[PDB]
Amino acid sequence: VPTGGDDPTKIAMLGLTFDDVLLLPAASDVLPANADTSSQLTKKIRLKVPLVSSAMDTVTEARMAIAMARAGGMGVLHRNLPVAEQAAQVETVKRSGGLLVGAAVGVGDDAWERAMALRDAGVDVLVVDTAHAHNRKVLDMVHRLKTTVGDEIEVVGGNVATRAAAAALVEAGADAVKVGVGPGSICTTRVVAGVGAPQITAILEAVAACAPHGVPVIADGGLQYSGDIAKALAAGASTAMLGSLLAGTAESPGELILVNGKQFKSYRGMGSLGAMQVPEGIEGRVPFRGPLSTVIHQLVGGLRAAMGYTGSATIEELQQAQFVQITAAG
Amino acid sequence: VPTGGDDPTKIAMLGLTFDDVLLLPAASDVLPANADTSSQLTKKIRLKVPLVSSAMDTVTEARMAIAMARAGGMGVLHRNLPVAEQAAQVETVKRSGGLLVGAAVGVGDDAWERAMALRDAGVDVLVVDTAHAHNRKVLDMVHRLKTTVGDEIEVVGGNVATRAAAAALVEAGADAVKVGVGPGSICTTRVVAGVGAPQITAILEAVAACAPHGVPVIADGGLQYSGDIAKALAAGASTAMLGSLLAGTAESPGELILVNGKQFKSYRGMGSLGAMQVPEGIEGRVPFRGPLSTVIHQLVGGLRAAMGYTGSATIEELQQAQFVQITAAG
Amino acid sequence: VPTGGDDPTKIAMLGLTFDDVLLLPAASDVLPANADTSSQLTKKIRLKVPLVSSAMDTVTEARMAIAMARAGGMGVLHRNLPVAEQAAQVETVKRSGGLLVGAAVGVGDDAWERAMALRDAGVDVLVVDTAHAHNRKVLDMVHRLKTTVGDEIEVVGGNVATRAAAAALVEAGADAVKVGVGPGSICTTRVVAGVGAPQITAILEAVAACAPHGVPVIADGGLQYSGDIAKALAAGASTAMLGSLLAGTAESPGELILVNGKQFKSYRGMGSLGAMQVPEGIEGRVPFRGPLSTVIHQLVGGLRAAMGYTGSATIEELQQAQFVQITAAG
């Protein structure tokens, strides 16, 4: 083995991130304005815009969830708050019209109670929301939810970063699989634990397990630009979950912060010290970006441009697009 | 597949940019001063210097086109202005002697009218000038122009970044194919859409489709140094189109700008907000560089040096030169 | 040969460092809090925490050795001081309870005398501590110590960076092999001598020689983050030796230094000018980090997280984990 030792499997793959690839233009009769951006969030739920906001306390509460649903996407309400409060946020969203909404639950002692209260509040999607979904407790929770409330609620499981982990969630009954271990802008898992998987490779691997079973993949973490959304979908994901890109919007929780004449909002990992109240997230800030509606327009605009360049009339067509790998110089 | 999934074609190639390669010196009896720098702009039109200025409103109006033709190259007049005005600029150039001139047209509602007015004004080259030429509307426009005015006017189509797209333009009747999707200094297509093709690979691919049919390739975008011109031609292009490298000259449109004691000129993408009046270009500035004649001398000087080092007596010989690929460290 | 010449062995391998790889998550029923972090320092000695402090005069004297042993690791007392003083430090440590302690010796004229005095003082581990252990004098010293005091004292040899060098130390009777030529944060061997071996590859190679003989590998140098400890162990090392990461602690030798409002401690290579009194180390500073106990908690916390993510119940299981290689972009 050229990189050391005698075991070719020790270094199992070469992991590519978003910056490692570009989409190749292809024959097209699709104008960006005419592309259909709709896509499956879960087996049953199709969104007008293939974007969902992160279940983070500096990204998604009721205001964000309402704005995301109105924009054609969806919000996933964070779970760093009492069960009654999270449930009350679900009701607030549902009372602003027939709007889709999701909510995160963990696998701890109060997770089941949380899930049932969210169910009672009329949640559409439950997201089993963990740092490591390749584990029996997480798989059991997904399965139990699907068997209990699965007729009326779609159940997402995550996060994973390998084909095997995605396959396990599929077998457990997941209605979507969320991919991302290590890539988040505020994530320090890579440096604290030394663990992660570059996101393009993670998506390609998860999709290899999920697409044959008709289970959509949600690409979660590491998306810095609108072009990354196109790359994630072309790699085979069906939707993208955004934290950093939405944390600077008016609708996110938290106050405006003025530093050196410029406007920012705080954005922090759910595994940061402040969120926990061994951290694997940081507490930072992102530029203030104005209203969500405007940010979503720019993000969807970039996606539409990519669909035009690749001749992709639909997201399902975009999932078949090809990449060129680039070097450091590029 | 080492990079993920089970499809070896998903990541179709490894794309190299100018910075990824150097020209290897070879046996030479060619002194730089004795090299012949002439090259085909189109099937019929040969230039003394293999350089043309970008069809951009901060690069080429009549003054630039006149200076470029006098220097042995050519200007392509931008199309971000009324048809009558663009046509009047063509006439201004033609009235400054027997000077070659080109002009850009799009494929929109007024493109045909624009083309005919430019034809009437005595334009030598029509450049069908689009972000994505791999499309029936663009191919139809090239073909229609060639069948209508092709006896008296050479028709260039662009831009493309793949062998297949170049092949389509050849079939449509293009007299030259312009290559570049993503590499422009002011381009944000790569980050907005996630789309592009590193330019050395794009040129090698386009040339593979174009050279067998005797159709010259114009390398457009990403050229930062005179050495990049040599690299583009060695990769098989016949001419290079320059934006950034010429935007700082006296002959480009726009005022001098003084910032922090240094002189600059504004340079902006035609897909920037200001040019459009979802942007895929930025508005920036480039150092002021003085007269075009002087810039062209330096650029051609570097090209001549490369021709000497590679033993290339002509541009056709330079097109057969070899590269070494370099690493990040280099 | 694509990189030059006609000898494929001239460039013998592609060397990976810590930053080149990440650990892949895997199926897990191991919670970080439940992982067993114990590991072999030497054939006979197992530590509660797989960490030992560097034998450097800005890292380990008696105070550090006592704190490291209490934290479940071990200190290796530096040898840049008179034999009597080093021996007295061993006694100071042993008089603070039944604490494990190691001490460095060289191979110079006074090395044997030093070793015997340390033996008399009750040292548990002798570390034959050299820049280049692939040499008969070093091998002889290891062998002589093992045959003379090997029943009561474990003998470590280092440093090496290749499979062959590790194999030689094993044959000589080493109870552990210490790996690291070039990677230290304060090391300039790479630039002064042009010599080194990227640490992940060095560990994989040394382990290939050592593991089949039941000899533990100590990964020494280049560890910048807690995640690097997990990577080193997953590459097959049994413990990690830390310099930079511990030099900023209260227990390290040396005063606090205030520069630009921030607190630091001096940290210097043992091959720096100041330590020698042709340098292959620098004299620098590292941020002040507070008490060792706290630093060790954070480092072990990150290790525990990695064990959870990789489904590793023990360090021996972690040694079987897999990596993904990452690119520059990642």
Next chain:
Amino acid sequence: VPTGGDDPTKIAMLGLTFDDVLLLPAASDVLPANADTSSQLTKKIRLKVPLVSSAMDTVTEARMAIAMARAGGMGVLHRNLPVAEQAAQVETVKRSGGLLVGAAVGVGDDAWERAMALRDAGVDVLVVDTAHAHNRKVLDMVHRLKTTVGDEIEVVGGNVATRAAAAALVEAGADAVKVGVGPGSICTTRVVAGVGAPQITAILEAVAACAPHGVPVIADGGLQYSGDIAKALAAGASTAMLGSLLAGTAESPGELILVNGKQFKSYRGMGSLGAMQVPEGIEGRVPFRGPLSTVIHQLVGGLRAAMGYTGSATIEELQQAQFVQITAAG
């Protein structure tokens, strides 16, 4: 072809520079202090230290040549001055004892006259000193010198960057071949012409042509650290030529320059504007480094360390050492 087009030879090799490789430690019974650093400058001339100073007007005049010879190396007097003056510098050196000295000549109209005057002055080595030696005029000059004065004077030819060019110089009768096109610290050939060859690969290729004919290779350009000297020799070169590393010494031509409280000396390419009086060099400055004797001691010290680490008793043994290739992260 993964990088574009259908010709596998278009991108002929992957070029490595010094930063791309490290020397692997190997079995050693060689202490750095006991290594023999002598090496062939040319077929007949062996130096005590394998270093020669660049033929540049900010590096080598008589003072530098005298100091280099006394240190066990040699200086090559630059040729940017009248023939009589260069000849007078040769005599100045020869009058400071039995000191070896070289002098550069070109291939222009006055080159032969220059060579004969240098011959008359008692020069030991004539260096045919060009940007591109792969050319009949250069080959003819080398051959003519060797046939005319070759019994009493050793003739070096350069510079080359390929196996074929080195082979041509060997056939022409060169007593040494000098390698380096593109790597010089003050060189802009890479950006102006787009031409060059990463130096480790260039050396491996030149050596493949030269070593089988017993012709030493001088590695010229790109050496930034003492470790680069070891790498160049391990790649198969017999000596290293230094510009930047010696330009900051007391013995180099030019005044001390004080900028922002720090001392520098000017260092400029011989193809810079100022040296010429289309530039392919820049005019810069390097830190003041004090006396040559001290710089040479540090450089030879690093070389000796490498010889120790690689078990190389002589430079001929060092030429057989192995490398590990490193990544960007390393």
